[PDB]
């Protein structure tokens, strides 16, 4: 098969910059039949289908910003975007139609801003949940920059790391923060022997650990 | 306005067969190639198989991944495009897409599909548990509060979340859901000012479409 490579895989830029993303073939895309590099560019923004941006390498899909700018020839192919926005946040993808169809891996294109630190909340077993015999803790970690970030969590001051499952929602496009969910799910009957809960979320716009707490006796 | 629907994805057990269509409108479906492409969760996009137009005698192409074992048809007369999955295996769970296409001749716009979700397993439909996330009851006060809702133990994807039916949109993370015991769990937040819960109303809508079940959950201070 033709084989198509992306690089990088991932790339961050601040508002206002240009990008630029590699694809490259395993054989030439031009049909010189009629002159033309059958190599097409995609923008899929999560959760959205798929939306072709150029065609023939360089030639913009009507009504596409002419900040998205397609070049190259034959085996090399480079997408270009000028003064990146917000909303542009997602995920391209090259595809070759020289044989047949085959997209790329794809490169995910994430937008920088000014570090900040995560609201964290902390929320015990509901009692609705404990009557059907589950028990599970939930820290939320909203709005924070960057996406790297550590929670511990801790039962009469000591550590836990199984039944601990974290989950991150995708770059908010609006404010470009991240938030993540960390819930920690025990029996009812370990719930119930211990007193004193706790998550820490360790990011580095501060040294100081921000903890959330609760404590069954109050 | 140009139109592709795809419909008949769904839950699958491995080794079985599935049927997805994509219904066309807007355009002379018989003068068009029509393209399937799939993407698993949080994988890349994966282009299938074409299915020619008119002059180039409705003939097939396909990715060798599925050559073999997955056809590609049209029902001309209603214009229709299918995918016909046969020996399915747990690989092949992803969003199916319909997309118009073409030989690059000739310069035509994209059309794709909003798609359609395959889910291959061994797991039953099962619908989800919502419990309400209120504050501790020792929580105290401030300017902003955070409430949630905790969506546990369903199958298949999707879930969606909405708050007050979608009158607090603004402040609301909903995370990806997760897989645990071969179930689906997943957490919703809510921040609104403290002056406006519990005062008014807070209540999370948990849609799951796939058991036809929606959950209203009201949010109620603990004690």
């Known amino acids: 098969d033709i084989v198509m490579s992306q690089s990088p895989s991932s790339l961050a830029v601040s508002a206002g910059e240009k990008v630029t993303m590699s694809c490259k073939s395993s054989?030439?895309?031009?049909?010189?039949?009629?002159?033309?590099?059958?190599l097409a560019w995609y923008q899929q923004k999560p959760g959205q289908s798929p939306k072709l941006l150029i065609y023939w390498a360089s030639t913009r899909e009507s009504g596409v910003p002419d900040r998205f700018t397609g070049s190259g020839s034959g085996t090399d192919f480079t997408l270009t975007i000028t003064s990146v926005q917000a909303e542009d946040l997602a995920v391209y993808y090259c595809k070759q139609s020289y044989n047949l169809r085959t997209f790329g891996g794809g490169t995910k294109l994430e937008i920088k801003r000014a570090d900040a630190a995560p609201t964290v909340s902390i929320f015990p077993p509901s009692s609705e949940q404990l009557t059907s015999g589950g028990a599970s803790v939930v820290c939320f970690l909203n709005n924070f920059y960057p996406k790297d970030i550590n929670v511990k969590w801790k039962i009469d001051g000591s550590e836990r790391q199984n039944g601990v499952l974290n989950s991150w929602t995708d770059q908010d496009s609006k404010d470009s923060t991240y938030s993540m969910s960390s819930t920690l799910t025990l029996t009812k009957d370990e719930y119930e022997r211990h007193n004193s809960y706790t998550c820490e979320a360790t990011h580095k716009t501060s040294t100081s650990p921000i903890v959330k707490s609760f404590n069954r006796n109050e | 306005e140009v139109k592709l629907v795809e419909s008949g994805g769904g839950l699958v057990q491995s080794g079985g067969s599935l049927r997805l269509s994509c219904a066309t409108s807007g355009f002379t479906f018989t003068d068009y190639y029509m393209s399937w492409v799939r993407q698993p969760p949080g994988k890349a996009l994966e282009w299938l198989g074409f299915?020619?137009?008119?002059?180039?005698?409705?003939?097939?192409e396909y990715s060798p991944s599925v050559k073999g074992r997955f056809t590609i048809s049209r029902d001309n007369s209603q214009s229709i495009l299918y995918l016909q999955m046969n020996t399915l295996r747990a690989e092949d769970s992803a969003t199916y897409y319909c997309?118009?296409?073409?030989?690059?001749?000739?310069?035509?716009?994209?059309?794709w599909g909003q798609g359609t979700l395959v889910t291959v397993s061994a797991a039953k439909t099962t619908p989800p548990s919502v419990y309400p996330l209120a504050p501790g009851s020792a929580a105290q006060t401030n300017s902003m509060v955070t409430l949630g809702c905790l969506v546990k133990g369903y199958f298949p994807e999707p879930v969606t979340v909405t708050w007050n039916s979608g009158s607090l949109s603004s402040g609301v993370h909903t995370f990806p859901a997760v897989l645990q015991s071969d179930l689906y769990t997943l957490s919703s937040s809510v921040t609104v000012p403290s002056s406006t819960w519990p005062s008014e109303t807070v209540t999370c809508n948990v849609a799951h479409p796939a058991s036809s079940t929606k959950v209203d959950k009201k949010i109620v201070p603990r004690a």
């Open positions: 054989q030439s895309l031009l049909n010189s039949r009629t002159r033309k590099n059958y």
């Open positions: 299915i020619r137009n008119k002059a180039n005698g409705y003939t097939t």
């Open positions: 997309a118009r296409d073409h030989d690059g001749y000739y310069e035509r716009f994209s059309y």
